[PDB]
Structure formats: structure tokens, C-alpha cells
Amino acid sequence: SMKLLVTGGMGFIGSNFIRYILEKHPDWEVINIDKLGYGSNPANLKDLEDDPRYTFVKGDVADYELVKELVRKVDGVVHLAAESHVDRSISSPEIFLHSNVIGTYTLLESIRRENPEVRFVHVSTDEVYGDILKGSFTENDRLMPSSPYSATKAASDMLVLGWTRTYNLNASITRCTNNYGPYQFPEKLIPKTIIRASLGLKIPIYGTVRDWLYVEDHVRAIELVLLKGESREIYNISAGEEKTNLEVVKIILRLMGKGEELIELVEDRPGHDLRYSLDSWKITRDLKWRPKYTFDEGIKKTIDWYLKNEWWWKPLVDERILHPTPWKL
Amino acid sequence: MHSMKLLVTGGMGFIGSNFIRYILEKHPDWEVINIDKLGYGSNPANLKDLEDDPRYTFVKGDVADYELVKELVRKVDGVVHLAAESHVDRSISSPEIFLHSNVIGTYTLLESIRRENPEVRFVHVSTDEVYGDILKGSFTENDRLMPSSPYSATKAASDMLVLGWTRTYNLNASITRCTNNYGPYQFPEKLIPKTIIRASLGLKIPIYGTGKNVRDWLYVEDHVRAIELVLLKGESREIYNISAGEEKTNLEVVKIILRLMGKGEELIELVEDRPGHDLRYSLDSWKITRDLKWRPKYTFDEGIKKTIDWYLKNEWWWKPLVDER
Ligand SMILES: NC(=O)c1ccc[n+]([C@@H]2O[C@H](COP(=O)([O-])OP(=O)(O)OC[C@H]3O[C@@H](n4cnc5c(N)ncnc54)[C@H](O)[C@@H]3O)[C@@H](O)[C@H]2O)c1
Ligand SMILES: NC(=O)c1ccc[n+]([C@@H]2O[C@H](COP(=O)([O-])OP(=O)(O)OC[C@H]3O[C@@H](n4cnc5c(N)ncnc54)[C@H](O)[C@@H]3O)[C@@H](O)[C@H]2O)c1
């Protein structure tokens, strides 16, 4: 038995985490605090809404008065809440400083002021390290954020490290690569590709890597870090499946029992030239974490989910996404 | 780069004041605008002697005050960011002021730069405390951070914002991380000034815990020289560690001072206190030495003698700063 406070639970990874957690732990309870902003989708958890072990609290993690009350009553806290739209972070960084930095600060304060013994897991990104042409970053390498989004995520990581040592908290930090799977919004590469291909639409590919991690595997890692991770430690999480968009697309089509005629290579486009790579040996060695699904198995499960849940993504797709020739406008 | 106008934040502080005096003294056609909120660590007397110089102007305000700082940032050619809440113990007691000044303050200044003067030369001044403890060896700019207090955590958070903003808005900015400064104008509460003052009064010397804490000691003037070098020749998006290579335990520092002052090591009495303080801090400053040719102009031996002398000759300064404690 363990009561968990999951922030940003109405989002992509948060929802997957909550469903997984309640399914694997009959006696656990979850309180989901989500502000219902960018990326949130109540539909993600509508079938669990009334499960007695689940409670939804609409609010901002930056709301100390509200957050302290929730932190006071749980055994663990899994922090997924954040603003993560890069281009949006470049236009209006304020949004990111508030949710990513102030929000994490507020959670840390509520934890050390109300319940310093609570188990805290801070979820972060592989983007904090910046790009790398060859090799992979370990948790002992410096950070080099290239956007307000990653800079604010990086800033939040630093506060967690500091508060943990200052107030002797029981907190760990996780950093993962690109997630894919159920409940990911339609314009993301993999979902967009599956949707468009099922509709016989051309899949653009600008000018012929990134590590791809099946969301459930990320979820399993977080669970492991929650129950066995050591305080004051950062844990990189990666599947070691670095592929280019063309590679991803070719595999999706194959697994959809199709041909590659849908691939339309157009002229190249800006700022998609960087490689991100995480060395996840630490978590492998210490917590024995290993991916449970291969890229093929994860994509196959992702294909099946999107084809059977048109009810979910359909309301979310616009016109850019279903457009015959989107690479033109 | 001649005729350069500078906005110095936190200029009413220990390092800030030393920096301002040095720069105005060294560059006859430069100008300085000092913005300081007059909070902890502030002392107007530090610059009372040049406060009327035509090239100097003081502005009372917080760097977190966007409307006020934006106007100053727009008209200068360089920004040296020193302002910050830098007291470790106060940060543990009440971290809020540290989040505000260190994180919010830096964020606001960064916004002023990107929006009103993206071409200004910015130097963000930070600390060796961001890397945390290290038993053996030294940290390079390529090593992870591991702040152990709210003070160093918020300073570390500020460093990260600077890196991200610089790459996002193509700014001309660098970060500096130095070790323990010592020298003229440091408050009596600090180790070296306190030891000198106590010793000059035949009073016993309070060392903390066991005084085995290891720190690199950098003469404030060598630190400002390093800052000047980074300002004028440092590369954007680069971090520069600054260390003297004078690592000593607190006990060692005290014994040195006593010897040079003519007192006995019997005045030494360890008092116990050690919450959020760390055993050893050590920075590898090879980068700045190799690229910018920076090296300490004074050894610790020469620096501590200049310091001892300054305090004995300037009681007028620390007199009203000494409390009952
Ligand atoms: N999606 C990925 O591939 C990926 C990769 C690496 C790291 N991450 C990290 O994992 C975490 C979860 O991201 P996600 O992909 O599920 O994104 P998401 O955008 O789908 O959802 C974020 C959720 O958090 C909520 N939220 C945002 N700010 C909040 C605030 N201040 N208070 C309360 N709720 C708030 C939103 O309303 C939303 O439900 C983030 O911290 C992100 O940085 C995601
Ligand atoms: N003293 C050291 O040994 C040392 C070592 C490494 C790094 N540093 C760094 O050097 C810088 C200067 O520190 P210092 O030692 O002179 O400390 P200090 O405490 O003596 O002075 C700090 C100054 O900044 C001002 N200030 C604080 N917050 C402000 C805000 N929001 N707006 C405007 N002014 C503000 C104060 O009023 C004060 O005059 C800091 O960034 C610190 O982190 C100092």
C-alpha cells in the first residue's frame, strides 16, 4: 500500500503511468494534480475517473496552499508536470519558468515544510545535456540546455539536487529520451505517421538520430526508481534505439503491413539536425532496469492502439495533419 | 573596446565594490552604473570615495525589477552580474529570497538583454559551490553540478538559465565560477576578516567544527582581473572556472594569519557548527589560463599580508560592522 501524488497526470506519460500503477498495484492510491493546460486530455483517464483509488485535483503545482495539502497526505510524489513545447518556450519563456522552475520549487518547499520523508521522483529530459555528435552523456556530465524549455527543466533539476541535500529529502531525478505509445498527441512523429498512413496520405520526410523509448518502458523505469532509486541520484533512461525519422517511418509502414510508396522526400527544413543521446548504464547496473519491448514490439503496440482508438485522436487532429501536401503549407 | 560603459549589478557588495574600483582605476574612459538593492552584504561606504566621480552612477533597485533594469541594460556595452543573495546559512533558513534574487533576478536580467540589448557583453558571476563536494581532484567546466544548499542550488539554476538563453537568443555571454574570495571590504563575519580582527584584540579564534574544511583562497583583486579578462576576451557560451591553486583547511588559514600577526596558536578554539557546509571545494581553472592567459598576480602568502594590512589600517570600515557577536 502506497498513496501517490502524480503531477501532470492528465498528460501523455502521466496518464500512462497512472493506468499502469493502478493496474499493477491493487492497494495503491493516486491523486492526480493537473492544471489542464497544454498537452492535457481528460479523455486519457476517463475510464478511471470514478475508480475509488483515483482522485483528480485540478490545480497548479505552483499553488503552494493547494499543493501542500496534497503532499501532506501521500507516501510518494511522481513529478511529471511541466510546459514542454520548445518553440513556445522561445516565444514566451515566462510560461516555462513558472511551471518548470517555480512549480518544482513549490513542490520541493511543500515537501520539506510538510513531509520531508515522502519519496520524491523528479521527471526530467535528455535535452538538459544539449546535443552530442558522438557518444552519450552520463549523469556526471555538465548540462548545456539550448532552449528556455530545457534550460528551465535543467534549472529545476538543480533545485531538486540542492533541496534534497539541504533538507535530507528522499528524492531522485530521472532523465529520459523520446517517448512514444498510447495517448501521445497526433502531431508527434509516430502518431502522425500511423494516422496519415492509415488514411493513404503521403508521409513527408525532409531531406532523408533520436532515441525512442516505449512509454510503458519509461513508466516501468520510473516505478523502479520510485521503489529502489537512491536519494540524491540522477538516473538516465534510454532504450538504445537511436533512429532517424526515415528509419522510424520505414518501420511503421512495414509493421502496418504496407509498402513504402507513401514516403515523399521533400526539400530540407531548419533546426532538425541535432543528436541527443543518453548513457543509461547507471540505472541498468544499480536497479537492473532493461527495456521490456523492442522498438518493433513498441511500434506494433502503438499502431494497434491508434487504429482501435480513433475516438481518442480524431478530435485532436486538425488539417495540417490530414493535409495531402503539408510540406507546402 | 575602449570607452566601454558597464552595468555592474551588486556593486555595493564585497566583490562588486572591488571590481568597480579596479575597473574605474584601470580604464580612464570607461563608465559604471551600479545597480544594487542595498540588501544583505551591501555597504555604501565601500565606494564612498568615488561615488561622486563623473563616470560612476548608483541606482538603487532590484535586478528583478524589469522596468527599472531594462532601461539600464539598453544603454550599456557590457553587463557584469554580481548581485545575489550569497549567504549559505540564510539560504537554508529561508530559501525564498535566494530563489528571487538568484533565479528570478538572473532570469529578469536575461530577458532585459535578449529583448533590449542582445548584443551587450554579458558576464554572469557564479561560484565553485555549484559543483558540490569533492574528496580528491578538481572539477572542470564539463562536470555535472551538485549544489548542497539553497544558495548554491539557485546559483546553479541561474547558470543553467544563462546557458539556455545565450544559445536561444544568440547572446554574447559567458559564466565565471570562482573560489573563496578574501581581501579588502569583506565583512567581519567571514573567516579571514574575523580572524584578523579577533587576533588584533587578543581574543580567541572561533573555528568551525574541526576546521578541516578545504577551500581554495583567491585574492579578490585576482578574481576581478579574471572577470575583466573574461569580459573583454572570453568566448560566448563558455564557462570559466577561476581558482588560485591555494587550497587550505580553515585551520591552516587561521594559523598562517596568527603567525604573520605575532599571536600564538593557543588563541585557537574550535566552535561547532556544520549543517549545509561541505568538506572540500576544488576547481580546475586550466581553461581560462590556457585561453585567456589568466594567472594569480598574488600568492596566498602575498595576498593574506595585503589583507591583514588593509584591515589593521582601515578599522574605520569594519568598526560599525562588528556586532556583539
Ligand atoms: N514526451 C516525451 O517524449 C518526454 C521526453 C523527455 C522528458 N519528458 C518529460 O516528462 C514529463 C511529462 O511530459 P509529457 O510528455 O507527458 O507532456 P504533456 O505535455 O503531455 O503533459 C504535461 C502535463 O502536465 C500538466 N502541467 C503543466 N504545467 C503544470 C503546472 N504548472 N501544474 C500542474 N500541471 C501542469 C499539463 O496540464 C499536462 O497534463 C515532462 O516533465 C517532460 O519534460 C517527456
Ligand atoms: N565571496 C565569495 O567568496 C564568492 C565566491 C564565489 C562566487 N561569489 C559570487 O560573487 C557574487 C558577489 O558576491 P559577494 O561575495 O560580493 O557577496 P555580497 O553578499 O557581499 O554582496 C551581494 C550584493 O548584491 C546585492 N544584491 C543581492 N540581491 C540583489 C538583487 N536582487 N538586485 C540587486 N542587488 C542585489 C546586495 O545588495 C549586495 O550589495 C555573487 O554572485 C556570488 O555568488 C562570491
Distance in angstroms (rounded) separating the CA atoms of residues A167 and A113: 9
Contact A151 B144 (CB under 8 A): no
Distance in angstroms (rounded) separating the CA atoms of residues B29 and B54: 11
**CA-to-CA separations, B104 to A69, A124, A292, B91, B210, in angstroms, rounded:** 26, 21, 42, 15, 36
Distance in angstroms (rounded) separating the CA atoms of residues A249 and A80: 28
Category of A288 on φ-ψ map: left (φ > 0), alpha (ψ -120 to 50) or beta? left
**CA-to-CA separations, A141 to A103, A165, A235, A279, B173, in angstroms, rounded:** 25, 20, 12, 10, 21
Domains by residue range for chain B, with CATH: 1-179+220-242+279-297 (3.40.50.720), 180-219+243-278+298-325 (3.90.25.10)
* Amino acid identity for residue A39 in this structure: G
Pairing relation of β-strands A54-58 and A203-206? unpaired
- Based on the number of CB atoms within 10 Å of its own CB, is B121 exposed (0-12), middle (13-18) or buried (19 or more)? buried
Torsion angle (degrees, nearest 10) of CA A108, B274, B39, A93: -30
**CA-to-CA separations, A228 to A23, A82, A108, A286, B260, in angstroms, rounded:** 19, 24, 20, 9, 54
Return the biggest CA–CA distance within chain A: 59
Contacts of A6 (CB under 8 A, 6+ apart): A14, A17, A18, A21, A30, A31, A32, A33, A77, A78, A80
Closest atom of ligand 2 to B218 CA is: 3
Q: Would you say how long chain A is, in residues?
A: 329
Residues with CB under 6 A from ligand 2: B 9-10, 12-16, 35-42, 62-64, 82-86, 101, 105, 125, 127, 155, 178, 180-181
* Amino acid identity for residue B76 in this structure: V
Ligand 2 mean position, distance from CA A46 (Å):
51
Q: How many CA atoms lie within 13 A of A8 on its CB side?
A: 23
Q: Are the C-beta atoms of B218 and B155 separated by less than 8 Å?
A: no
Distance in angstroms (rounded) separating the CA atoms of residues B189 and A168: 27
Residues 67-86 of A with CB under 8 A from B: none
Residue B129 annotated among the catalytic residues of the structure? yes
Please state the φ and ψ torsions of residue B147, each to the nearest 5 degrees.
-60, 135
* Amino acid identity for residue B14 in this structure: F
Q: Which of A218, A236, A116, A106 is nearest to A171 (CA)?
A: A116
Judged by its nearest atom, the ligand closest to the C-alpha of residue B104 is 2
Distance in angstroms (rounded) separating the CA atoms of residues A225 and B220: 44
Taken in order A39, B161, B67, B99, the sign of the CA dihedral is positive
Secondary structure (3-state) at B283 = strand
Distance in angstroms (rounded) separating the CA atoms of residues B16 and B37: 13
Q: Are the C-beta atoms of A16 and A216 separated by less than 8 Å?
A: yes
Helices marked H in B241-299: 250-261, 286-292
Q: Which of A186, A159, A84 is nearest to A125 (CA)?
A: A84
* Amino acid identity for residue B114 in this structure: R
Q: Are the C-beta atoms of A150 and A87 separated by less than 8 Å?
A: no
Contacts of B67 (CB under 8 A, 6+ apart): none
SS3 string of chain A? Answer: CCEEEEECCCCHHHHHHHHHHHHHCCCCEEEEEECCCCCCCHHHHCCCCCCCCEEEEECCCCCHHHHHHHHHCCCEEEECCCCCCHHHHHHCCHHHHHHHHHHHHHHHHHHHHHCCCCEEEEEEEHHHHCCCCCCCECCCECCCCCCHHHHHHHHHHHHHHHHHHHCCCEEEEEEECEEECCCCCCCCHHHHHHHHHHCCCCEEEECCCEEEEEHHHHHHHHHHHHHHCCCCCEEEECCCCEECHHHHHHHHHHHCCCCCCCEEEECCCCCCCCCCCECCHHHHHHHCCCCCCCHHHHHHHHHHHHHHCHHHHHHHCCCCCCCCCHHHC
| Residue A283, number of CB atoms within 10 A of its CB | 24
Q: Which of A50, A53, A47 is nearest to A22 (CA)?
A: A53
Q: Are the C-beta atoms of A215 and A283 separated by less than 8 Å?
A: no
Residues 253-272 of B with CB under 8 A from A: none
Q: Which of B223, B81, B90 is nearest to B162 (CA)?
A: B81
* Amino acid identity for residue B83 in this structure: A
Q: Are the C-beta atoms of B132 and A232 separated by less than 8 Å?
A: no
Which position has the grid cell 522561445?
A: A90
Distance in angstroms (rounded) separating the CA atoms of residues B284 and B300: 17
**CA-to-CA separations, A23 to A51, A289, B230, in angstroms, rounded:** 11, 20, 56
Q: Which of A117, A225, A128 is nearest to A172 (CA)?
A: A225
- Counting ligand 1 atoms within 8 A of each CB, the residue from A7, A12, A178 with the most, and so the one to mutate, is A12
Q: Are the C-beta atoms of B99 and A156 separated by less than 8 Å?
A: no
Could you tell me which residues are beta bridge partners of residue B122? B79, B173
Please state the φ and ψ torsions of residue A32, each to the nearest 5 degrees.
-105, 115
Q: Which of A284, A314, A282, A312 is nearest to A16 (CA)?
A: A312
Query: Considering just the CA atoms, what is the radius of gyration of chain B in Å?
Result: 19
Distance in angstroms (rounded) separating the CA atoms of residues B222 and B300: 11
Contacts of B17 (CB under 8 A, 6+ apart): B11, B43, B46, B47, B185
Q: How many CA atoms lie within 13 A of A137 on its CB side?
A: 29
Q: Which of B250, B239, B249, B221 is nearest to B284 (CA)?
A: B239
How far is Cα of residue A4 from the mean position of the Cα atoms in its chain?
A: 18
Distance in angstroms (rounded) separating the CA atoms of residues A154 and B200: 47
Distance in angstroms (rounded) separating the CA atoms of residues B261 and B289: 33
Residues on chain A touching B112 (C-beta within 8 angstroms): none
Q: Helix A215-228 to helix A12-24 angle, to the nearest 10 degrees?
A: 60
- Based on the number of CB atoms within 10 Å of its own CB, is B74 exposed (0-12), middle (13-18) or buried (19 or more)? middle
DSSP 8-class letter at B323? -
Distance in angstroms (rounded) separating the CA atoms of residues A203 and A206: 10
Distance in angstroms (rounded) separating the CA atoms of residues B264 and B317: 26
Contact A158 B161 (CB under 8 A): no
Distance in angstroms (rounded) separating the CA atoms of residues B61 and B249: 37
**CA-to-CA separations, B297 to A318, B128, B257, B294, in angstroms, rounded:** 65, 20, 20, 9
Q: Would you say how long chain B is, in residues?
A: 325
Distance in angstroms (rounded) separating the CA atoms of residues A83 and B248: 45
Helix (H) / strand (E) containing B96: helix B96-98
Q: Are the C-beta atoms of A280 and A237 separated by less than 8 Å?
A: yes
Contact A141 B142 (CB under 8 A): yes
Looking at the complex, report in whole angstroms how far the Cα of residue B161 sits from the nearest Cα belonging to chain A: 5
Q: Which of A208, A118, A188, A123 is nearest to A157 (CA)?
A: A123
Secondary structure (3-state) at B36 = strand
**CA-to-CA separations, A182 to A12, A219, A304, A312, B218, in angstroms, rounded:** 8, 12, 9, 10, 56
Distance in angstroms (rounded) separating the CA atoms of residues B16 and B102: 15
- Based on the number of CB atoms within 10 Å of its own CB, is A106 exposed (0-12), middle (13-18) or buried (19 or more)? buried
Distance in angstroms (rounded) separating the CA atoms of residues B322 and B325: 8
What contacts 24+ positions apart, CB below 8 Å, involve A307-316?
A307/A194, A307/A198, A309/A182, A312/A43, A312/A183, A313/A185, A313/A186, A313/A191, A313/A195, A315/A43, A316/A41, A316/A185, A316/A186
Pairing relation of β-strands A210-214 and A242-243? antiparallel
Q: Which of B216, B206, B188 is nearest to B127 (CA)?
A: B216
